[PDB]
Structure 1
Amino acid sequence: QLTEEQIAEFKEAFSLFDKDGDGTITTKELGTVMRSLGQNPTEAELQDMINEVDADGNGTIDFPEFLTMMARKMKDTDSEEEIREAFRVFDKDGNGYISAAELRHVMTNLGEKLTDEEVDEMIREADIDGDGQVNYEEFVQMMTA
């Protein structure tokens, strides 16, 4: 049961995958976004992910299919485990901290190229201890908010 607000957010997410703007997500487009953030799914794995969401079996995900799967499968909140996995992806050297560079890396690959001041403001919003980086607990707060 999605609100206008949620639809707008999902449209933006769908659009990142749908890089050619044709209103469908292919295996290729899904693979591209995944690899761009450090995932290494095999082709068969990608194909399964598509087939899972592709209700009409025509081989691509369209927006109605995407929204329907969101309404059927999404959680109310980001789960604890999803937050731990996402922290891993941001903290790609595994040093325990998300740095401005690691944050910029993720944001650019989510289709948002930010200035240094904007990256720094993002960090500032999360940065409880004022050290200039986002640790695990600070990241949890930003994800549960």
Structure 2
Amino acid sequence: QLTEEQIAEFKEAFSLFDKDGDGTITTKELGTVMRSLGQNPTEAELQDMINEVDADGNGTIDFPEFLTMMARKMKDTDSEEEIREAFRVFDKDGNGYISAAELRHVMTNDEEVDEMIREADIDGDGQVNYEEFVQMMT
């Protein structure tokens, strides 16, 4: 486990994100912190970015989830975020499933991409999802 000073500084950051001190980061607190930083996050994006690290799905970020997020964000570059962004920009239709037509389209900027599709479709659902994309990335 982390040392005393690291735990203290991570608790300081958590309390910075937790105004009321109830121990969980409500989406309102994250929204007001982001607005204090000059950003204008909508409720949909706020909820989407608060459930990225919400492991238990209760709708709030407790201390272990914040610690995991910090472990993800302490490094200069996070591979998970970049892979997610690449998958997003691949998905032109925005449905969460990159079709074979989009896979062909993103290369023109035949057999190789077909092999990629064959080896990426782990569940055999006829398409590629985010979990398959990150499995292929690693």
What TM-score, normalized to structure 1? 0.49
1:106 is the counterpart of 2:113:
no
Q: Which runs of 5+ in 1 are unaligned?
A: 110-115
CA distance in 2, matches of 1:41, 1:84: 19
CA distance in 1, matches of 2:15, 2:108: 14
Q: Deviations over 1:61-118 (max 9, x none)?
A: 0001111222244206999999999999999999999999999999999xxxxxx999
Asked whether the equivalents of residues 38 and 89 of structure 1 are also in contact (C-alpha less than 8 Å), the reply is no
Instruction: Tell me the SS of whatever aligns to 1:134.
Output: coil
Which structure dedicates a bigger proportion of its chain to strand?
A: 1
CA distance in 2, matches of 1:86, 1:137: 13
Cα 1:103–1:61, aligned 2, differ >3 Å: closer, same or farther?
farther
Superposed CA RMSD: 12.8
Cα 1:122–1:84, aligned 2, differ >3 Å: closer, same or farther?
same
CA distance in 1, matches of 2:113, 2:66: 30
Cα 1:100–1:55, aligned 2, differ >3 Å: closer, same or farther?
closer
Higher relative contact order (CA 8 A, sep 6+): 1
Asked whether the equivalents of residues 26 and 61 of structure 2 are also in contact (C-alpha less than 8 Å), the reply is yes
Q: Deviations over 1:14-43 (max 9, x none)?
A: 101111110000111100111012111111
Asked whether the equivalents of residues 37 and 106 of structure 1 are also in contact (C-alpha less than 8 Å), the reply is no
Structure 2 match to 1:113:
none
Cα 1:65–1:87, aligned 2, differ >3 Å: closer, same or farther?
closer
Post-superposition offset of 1:2: 3.8
CA distance in 1, matches of 2:35, 2:104: 16
Cα 1:4–1:100, aligned 2, differ >3 Å: closer, same or farther?
farther
Cα 1:52–1:4, aligned 2, differ >3 Å: closer, same or farther?
same
The size of the alignment, in residue pairs, is 138
1:134 is the counterpart of 2:132:
no
Asked whether the equivalents of residues 127 and 133 of structure 1 are also in contact (C-alpha less than 8 Å), the reply is yes
Q: Which has the larger radius of gyration?
A: 2
